[PDB]
Ligand binder design. Structure first.
Ligand SMILES: CCS(=O)(=O)N1CC(CC#N)(n2cc(-c3nc(Nc4ccc(C5CCN(C)CC5)c(F)c4)nc4[nH]ccc34)cn2)C1
Length: 297
């Protein structure tokens, strides 16, 4: 049976407006749902597959179930599913967030975004991740490209395409054949053992914190910095081999220009090779909110 109500979003009233994002295996479009053909039509975001397969459709159904199960201020809102092509295809309907990805927003508006604002965003991402952990979901793709901006005071985790549910009797998920792997955000045990956990999401959150404090300045991204350290001329698996060796022996992304030492210390604590010594998302949210609260000028 259809996982969701197939009459809620009928394909003939869903009208394409603009492309919002696109990758090799999915895209998000801005559409208008206008069942009354009148001004009573809401703008929505629609995720669809690209280069679909039976495997990818099965994974997409799991992703939709994940998103529908989540209800939190810092997670993008599920609205429904459109069973298009005569109920022989699936598209995911979500709220439209007007300011787009945090990665682009930081670049466009860096001149109005100070440290306390970056820490507000950090707090909100952490709270979304606390919530995901209560469901035993591992996000596996935390990065500013996957955070969305509702307004100047509110961000939300925006995509769950790589999210996995932990098995019942263990605290890690072992990925067999990876698809897209954002290796410059990965914890060392994900690179060396294919193991993903709440603690590897904490590692990647440290990379997100780094990204925020770089303001996505040219040449400061995690891939650009890790490649500068490894050697730009390298290529292929040798890059991964060097990345593993670098991380195992305490090589790390640098402190961004202007970043306070206390915030860099949070990043470095997330980037602990000892999985069990990494802070929890609860620890991080409290620490960041206390930092913000103790600021006044
Ligand atoms: C790679 C596989 S993917 O394509 O499926 N993937 C998912 C992916 C990454 C994540 N999360 N994504 C998601 C969305 C998305 N965007 C929006 N609003 C929006 C508004 C405005 C602009 C811009 C702004 C400024 N510029 C210059 C022009 C228009 C915008 F870009 C988006 N609302 C959304 N609600 C739900 C999802 C979503 C967007 N990208 C990417």
């Amino acid at each position: 049976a259809f996982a969701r109500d197939p009459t809620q979003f009928e394909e003939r009233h869903l009208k394409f407006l603009q492309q919002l994002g696109k990758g090799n295996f999915g895209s998000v479009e801005m559409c208008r749902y206008d069942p009354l053909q009148d001004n009573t039509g809401e703008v929505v975001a629609v995720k669809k597959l690209q280069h679909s397969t039976e495997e990818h459709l099965r994974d997409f159904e799991r992703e939709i179930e994940i998103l529908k199960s989540l209800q939190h201020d810092n997670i993008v809102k599920y609205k429904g599913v459109c069973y298009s092509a005569g109920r022989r295809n699936l598209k995911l309907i979500m709220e439209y967030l007007p300011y787009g990805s945090l990665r682009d927003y930081l670049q466009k508006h860096k001149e109005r975004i100070d440290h306390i604002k970056l820490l507000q965003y950090t707090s909100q991402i952490c709270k979304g991740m606390e919530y995901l952990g209560t469901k035993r979901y591992i996000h596996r793709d935390l990065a500013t490209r996957n955070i969305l901006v509702e307004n100047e005071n509110r961000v939300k985790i925006g995509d769950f395409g790589l999210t996995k549910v932990l098995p019942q009797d263990k605290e890690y998920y072992k990925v067999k054949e990876p698809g897209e792997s954002p290796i410059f955000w990965y914890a060392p045990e994900s690179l060396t053992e294919s193991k993903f956990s709440v603690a590897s999401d904490v590692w990647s959150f440290g990379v997100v914190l780094y990204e925020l404090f770089t303001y996505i300045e040219k040449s400061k991204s995690p891939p650009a910095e890790f490649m500068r350290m490894i050697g730009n001329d390298k290529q292929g698996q040798m890059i991964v081999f060097h990345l593993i060796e670098l991380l195992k022996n305490n090589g790390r992304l640098p402190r961004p220009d202007g970043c306070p030492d206390e915030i860099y210390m949070i990043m470095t604590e997330c980037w602990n090779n000892n999985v069990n010594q990494r802070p929890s998302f609860r620890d991080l949210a409290l620490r960041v909110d206390q930092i913000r609260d103790n600021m006044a000028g």
